[PDB]
């Protein structure tokens, strides 16, 4: 209830003019008071439209100002161009910055003037420094200046922060004011005509530096930020890679005193085990060389901070390092050229000096692993393999973005990347031919996409036709299903919605064991992902072909085989300016349904093969192996205690044993710690990487101005929990400026806290971080009922595409390829279902969401709507609340810290109740209705749709499920069986969980199965209305948790809920009209 004041102050500061007037608009759920709000509105519009003073009416309608609820504030201020500079001149009295062209290796990667690299605009491209975000540099500068101005009179520790950040913004703005501000167009791009006479890499550097200096709360933060901002102005290729590299060695220096374990995918069972740190000497020499490079780059304070820690090597001073490890990834992306980014991968050293004893075993192990995956379904003749064509054709929506191709749906032209749409086009024109897999050769090389991530190399992405997906789909789904229960596939061991994300190293760490962990992300152009890898799979397919008797299955397997034949020789379109290069690359990368699990297989075979060579010199028992994409780790135990010399010799043997297969590696062996892309451990304590740029993005998405603010808030919350903390008021300023909308040149609207923080398709953030807010009031209920009426909108593009002839042909072909003779009873159902997977195409979503925002805006302008009784969540909570009673409690501390970097209140909760131990289905995947969909398809259907579908009669359930690819007999059996009644409750569980972010954010980290939380939640049991007692216990838990988060202290509860209200609510249960935005979720693991 504080945000709107900051909004008002932002408006007053940014505009400042006599002509700048400020126009609130209010609402109340009570008619008479609402008409007085309407009156105030009216009179304000008039007064605005007559240059009359507004300050007089504000007393007359005092009641509305005190008790009614605000919506938004309008603003009439003219163009008044270039006022940002006219304000900014004062904060730029420092010295500007000079580039240094002889730092980056390349020529165009220096921060020199555009004209020195692109004299003509016809060869200009802003894509090497495009922020790719619908928010301006000017927005950032205005926000910083507003923060600095309002915090210009404080006298505390805050002032010690303020002087520091003021100096940082001085350093930045001197450099900016030296030349000027680039001006955004309507699309938030930056054209040639502003950058023609200015440095090319000023924008990303500026934004990244603003984000960093806005995340300063301490002295070391100031040192680090000043030491990166001033060097990131020139160095743009060897900086985040530099400071983020030693961490991998540092984790091998922290003694464990106390540990965490994993059992099943979120279980913990702590251990007081102590483990020393047997680090060799030569890795210190390596580390010393790395610090010499660090100092050689122009870094002074942060080596000293890295140097004074080694005197003790303690874990209490260690979070600084972790903090440092996150300060490296908030400098921006290294958006270099497609060519030079491919050549990070396309350097090959293929040699007729590798072993042959190794590759044959490698090939065989891949073959054997494949056979273990596929023995059962290939043999028992599963339906999903026979009809693999139809399976992939349904599951196209869960695929990659194919190359743009010109379509026509009746009377339009489309350049879609979605392969389902490609299929729709090719069926009509006789071009659909899935059995004949295209070659990939000189006559038709392959396109590319670029998988980027800062501080590392650029990975490549295949962008293929739609036959490759269809071939790989069914076989890869059975392989993944097999890997759900296999432990060693770290990407895929789960229980249908989880990953082993807290690792499985710490079981067998001891004084006798060691662990070798290894980054394997560069192993795409390598000689072990070419020929042997493919041929092992070919061999497995031969065996599997002899392991079935049906012909459809053998054909499907032969098509998958033929796909691997074509992938063994594969060329690659790569432009460079005007001319086009094509390079032989017959190997593996991402952009495929198969790449992930198959790379995991190949790394597993590789490490199993290598690890049987250390056996020539050591006796050990392989206890555990894990492989997940861009990393892999294996633990191993000895007959004795570990020494430095065994570590050194093992490392040399591992390095040379990879060299025997012609494979480069920075081999890393340790005893207590690991480092990988997504996480790392020191001293039996899990830390995480907070490297998600907020004000700069990887590539250019498709979301609106609105939703990118929500994405940024989720990333903000995440990074805060990780450790990287930014000052929240700046973020709120960005959110309001990104939700601000221009109705004319001078009219602009700004919504309020009570529109943006309400559970709908328009939620963006919360008034108090780590806490969703609900509505006990009339007013939040009122607007939630209003916004649900408006969330449902239309897309004319989708309506006209579904009315053409080709779509109709596609629906007909789906039917007669699946079932026939109900052409007007189910086929229409299948069209309505195909509509559910046209929405992946982005412009449809933009049409629909822009329509939602405009419909929202035409009642943000004018007064409010009653919305006609449509029941939602706050209606229920309104009725649950008046039979509560709170009382002060006092819980003790009995749970262990294992995420130090958290804010102290969340940690206090974790340090008093447990951390989560299960993961209950956000999708309802284990639900008996969903185990059909995961059997005949991959398709999601959103929990809104399922929660709705179950509310209907037993007739249209059959239509809706058969329309999702499922056959008719099992649907009829499901309805006759009466299993939906055994699944109303699970679906509603998942629904309510999706509505309230229970599996999305901070609430993913908390134990609701605790005995300590439960004894506070004293709601007696009634029985035979399970939903009510369920929601009551859940909501009471949420009350206690929100009180804990927002105030630190604890409370109890009690609800002697009357049976009358139990029954009144039981009927309100399965008629809920509520919804939560996809863009608002904050997955802690990305």
């Amino acid at each position: 209830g504080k945000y709107n004041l900051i909004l008002s102050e932002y408006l007053s500061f940014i505009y400042n003019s006599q002509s700048a007037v400020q126009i609130p608009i209010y609402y109340s759920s009570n008619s008479e008071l609402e008409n007085r709000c309407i009156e105030f509105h009216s009179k304000c519009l008039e007064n605005s439209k007559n240059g009359l003073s507004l300050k007089k009416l504000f007393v007359e309608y005092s009641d509305v100002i005190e008790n009614a609820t605000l919506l938004s504030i309008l603003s009439y201020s003219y163009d008044k161009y270039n006022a940002v500079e006219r304000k900014l001149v004062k904060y730029a009295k420092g010295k500007p910055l000079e580039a240094d062209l002889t730092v980056n290796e390349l020529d165009y990667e220096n921060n020199k003037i555009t004209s020195e690299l692109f004299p003509t605009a016809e060869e200009y491209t802003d894509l090497l420094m495009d922020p790719a975000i619908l928010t301006s540099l000017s927005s950032n500068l205005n926000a910083v200046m507003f923060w600095l101005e309002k915090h210009e009179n404080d006298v505390a520790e805050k002032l010690k922060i303020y002087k520091r950040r003021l100096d940082l913004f001085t350093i930045v703005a001197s450099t900016v004011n030296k030349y000027g501000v680039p001006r955004h167009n309507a699309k938030y791009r930056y054209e040639y005509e502003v950058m023609k006479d200015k440095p090319y890499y000023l924008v990303t550097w500026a934004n990244s530096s603003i984000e960093m200096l806005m995340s300063v709360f301490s002295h070391e933060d100031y040192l680090i930020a000043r030491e990166l901002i001033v060097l990131s102005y020139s160095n743009r290729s060897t900086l985040a890679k530099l400071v983020s590299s030693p961490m991998s060695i540092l984790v091998a220096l922290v003694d464990i005193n106390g540990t965490f374990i994993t059992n099943e995918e979120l279980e913990l069972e702590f251990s007081n085990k102590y483990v020393r740190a047997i680090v060799p000497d030569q890795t210190f020499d390596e580390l010393k060389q790395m610090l010499d490079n660090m100092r050689k780059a122009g870094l002074t304070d942060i080596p000293k901070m890295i140097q004074d820690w080694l005197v003790d090597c303690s874990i209490e001073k260690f979070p600084l390092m972790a903090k440092i490890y996150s300060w490296s990834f908030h400098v921006g992306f290294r958006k270099q050229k497609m060519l030079d980014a491919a050549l990070d991968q396309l350097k090959t050293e293929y040699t007729e000096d590798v072993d042959d004893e190794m590759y044959r075993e490698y090939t065989m192990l891949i073959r054997d692993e494949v056979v273990k995956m596929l023995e059962e379904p290939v043999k028992h003749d599963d339906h999903l393999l026979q009809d693999s064509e139809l399976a992939g054709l349904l599951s196209m929506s869960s695929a990659s973005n194919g190359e743009s191709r010109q379509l026509k749906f009746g009377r339009k032209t489309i350049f879609s990347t979605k392969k389902n749409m490609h299929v729709m086009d090719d069926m009509a024109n006789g071009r659909y031919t899935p059995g004949i897999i295209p070659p990939v050769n000189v006559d038709k090389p392959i396109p590319l996409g670029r998988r980027d991530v800062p501080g590392r190399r650029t990975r490549i992405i295949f962008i293929l036709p739609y036959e490759y997906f269809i071939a790989q789909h069914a076989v890869v789904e059975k392989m993944l299903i097999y890997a759900k229960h296999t432990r060693e596939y770290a990407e895929f061991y789960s229980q249908s919605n989880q990953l082993l994300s807290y690792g499985d190293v710490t079981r067998f760490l001891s004084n006798n064991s060691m662990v070798l962990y290894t980054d394997v992300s560069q192993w795409d152009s390598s000689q072990h992902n070419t020929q042997p890898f493919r041929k092992g799979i070919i061999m497995g397919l031969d065996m599997l072909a002899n392991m079935t008797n049906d012909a459809r299955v053998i054909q499907t397997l032969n098509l998958y085989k033929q796909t691997q034949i074509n992938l063994m020789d594969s060329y690659v379109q790569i432009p460079d300016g005007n001319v086009i290069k094509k390079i032989q690359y017959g190997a593996v990368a991402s952009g495929e349904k198969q790449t992930k699990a198959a790379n995991s297989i190949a790394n597993l075979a590789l490490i199993k093969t290598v690890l049987s060579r250390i056996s020539n010199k050591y006796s050990f028992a392989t206890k555990i192996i894990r492989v997940d994409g861009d990393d892999n780790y294996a633990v191993l135990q000895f007959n004795t205690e570990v020494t430095k010399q065994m570590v050194q010799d093992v490392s040399n043997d591992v390095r040379e044993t990879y060299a025997r297969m012609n494979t480069k590696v920075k081999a890393l062996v340790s005893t207590v710690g690991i480092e990988i892309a997504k996480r790392y451990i020191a001293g039996g304590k899990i830390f995480f990487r907070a490297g998600i740029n907020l004000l700069n993005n990887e590539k250019k998405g498709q979301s609106t101005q609105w939703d990118q603010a929500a994405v940024l808030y989720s990333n903000y919350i995440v990074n805060r929990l990780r450790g990287f903390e930014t000052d929240r008021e700046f973020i709120l300023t960005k959110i309001m400026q990104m939700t601000s909308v221009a109705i004319t040149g001078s009219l602009r609207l700004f919504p309020s806290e009570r529109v943006l923080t309400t559970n709908s398709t328009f939620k963006v953030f919360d008034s108090e971080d780590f806490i969703i807010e609900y509505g006990t009031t009339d007013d939040e209920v009122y607007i939630q009922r209003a916004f649900m009426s408006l969330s449902s909108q239309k897309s004319g593009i989708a309506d006209e595409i579904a009315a053409s002839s080709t779509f109709k042909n596609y629906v007909s072909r789906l039917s007669e390829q699946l079932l026939f003779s109900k052409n007007n009873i189910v086929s229409r159902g299948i069209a309505l279902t195909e509509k559910a997977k046209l929405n992946s195409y982005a412009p449809i979503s933009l049409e629909k969401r822009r329509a939602q925002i405009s419909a929202l805006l035409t009642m943000l302008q004018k007064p409010v709507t009653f919305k006609s009784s449509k029941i939602t969540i706050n209606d229920i909570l309104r009725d649950i609340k008046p039979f509560f009673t709170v009382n002060e409690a006092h819980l003790p501390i009995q749970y262990q810290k294992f995420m130090p970097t958290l804010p102290d209140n969340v940690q206090y909760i974790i340090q008093c109740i447990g951390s989560r131990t299960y993961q209950i289905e956000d999708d309802g995947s284990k639900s008996a209705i969903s185990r059909l969909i995961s059997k005949y398809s991959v398709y999601k259907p959103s929990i809104e749709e399922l929660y709705k579908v179950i509310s209907l009669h037993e007739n249209e359930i059959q239509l809706y499920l058969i329309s999702l690819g499922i056959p008719k007999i099992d649907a009829d059996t499901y309805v006759g069986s009466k299993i939906y009644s055994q699944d109303k409750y699970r679906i509603l569980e998942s629904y309510v969980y999706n509505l309230l972010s229970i599996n999305y954010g901070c609430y993913q980290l908390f134990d609701f199965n605790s005995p300590d939380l439960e004894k506070l939640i004293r709601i007696p049991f009634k029985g035979k209305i399970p939903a009510v007692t369920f929601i009551l216990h859940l909501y009471a838990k949420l009350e206690v948790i929100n009180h804990a988060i927002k105030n630190g202290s604890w409370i109890s509860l009690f609800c002697n809920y009357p049976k009358s209200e139990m029954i009144k609510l039981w009927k309100k249960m399965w008629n809920i009209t509520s919804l939560r935005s996809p863009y608002t979720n904050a997955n802690f693991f990305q």
């Binding site: 047997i278 100092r295 140097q307 080694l310 090597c313 205690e641 570990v642 020494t643 430095k644």
Partner: peptide, 28 residues
């Protein structure tokens, strides 16, 4: 520079001494 670096190398030998190694070294 290098005085503190060499002292880090030396003091990161005295610290974290393994016992079996000094036994085999006395033996060797």
């Amino acid at each position: 520079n290098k005085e503190e670096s060499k002292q880090l190398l030396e003091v990161l030998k005295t610290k974290e001494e393994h016992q079996k190694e000094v036994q085999y070294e006395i033996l060797q």
